[PDB]
Amino acid sequence: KNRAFLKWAGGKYPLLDDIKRHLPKGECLVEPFVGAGSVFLNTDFSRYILADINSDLISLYNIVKMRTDEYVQAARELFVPETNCAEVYYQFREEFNKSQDPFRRAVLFLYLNRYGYNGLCRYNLRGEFNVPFGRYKKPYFPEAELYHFAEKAQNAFFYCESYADSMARADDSSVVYCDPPYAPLSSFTLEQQAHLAEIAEGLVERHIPVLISNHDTMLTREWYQRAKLHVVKVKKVDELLALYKP
DNA sequence: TTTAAAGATCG
DNA sequence: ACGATCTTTAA
């Protein structure tokens, strides 16, 4: 199982096996919520259309793809014992928020992701990364995961856009896998959740297979009503895999 | 400026 | 989800 080089929400490693079993075959894979791209790294499609609303994430992916060796060498400098402390961390965080260079920001972004608290990615309304120091014993430098991402990225396009705009890139050769932010058990609104389901029903009308993963609640069961539902056993909340087969 | 509730900040 | 301390919002 290929691991992403980033700490990210919805890694979904345990249920990667369930995704592949319910994900149809096609020429191209479309991911509106690529995130860490665990599905992308653990599937084998000819082409990939990978999208996310996070511009720092998308910019990082483009840098890693086009400038792999240059990036790895520069980023590896950050992962040494001297940079594993609060004072250095907050200066690099400040440098990141003030940097105008995409390459430099991409380098610092990996450092912040690995040395920051819980591997979180949080911004204020000023667009500034404000995750505190994580204080780990020894953050891991994902060199192998980086090179593996770069090689697989050669068959992928990265776009920074909302799900509605990325799913419209899908055609008949396409297969769409959606991994939206989790639905409430008691940002991403409820309207966007239902809208995603409606867009899915639109694609399946044009003979485009769509697979959506989410929590198994009352709202999600209602939203994905027109889909072939599968429940995976993970309060005790299970996950739901909604399949819109043409 | 006042006021109260709400939202935002960031360790 | 936490919490003290900011800013925001509307009459």
Ligand SMILES: C[S@@+](CC[C@H](N)C(=O)[O-])C[C@H]1O[C@@H](n2cnc3c(N)ncnc32)[C@H](O)[C@@H]1O
């Ligand atoms: C919970 S993560 C899942 C990522 C991915 N499935 C993985 O394996 O890491 C969902 C991602 O969707 C992106 N996202 C959030 N809201 C979005 C929106 N309204 N439109 C498009 N993408 C969005 C976020 O940047 C986030 O990284």
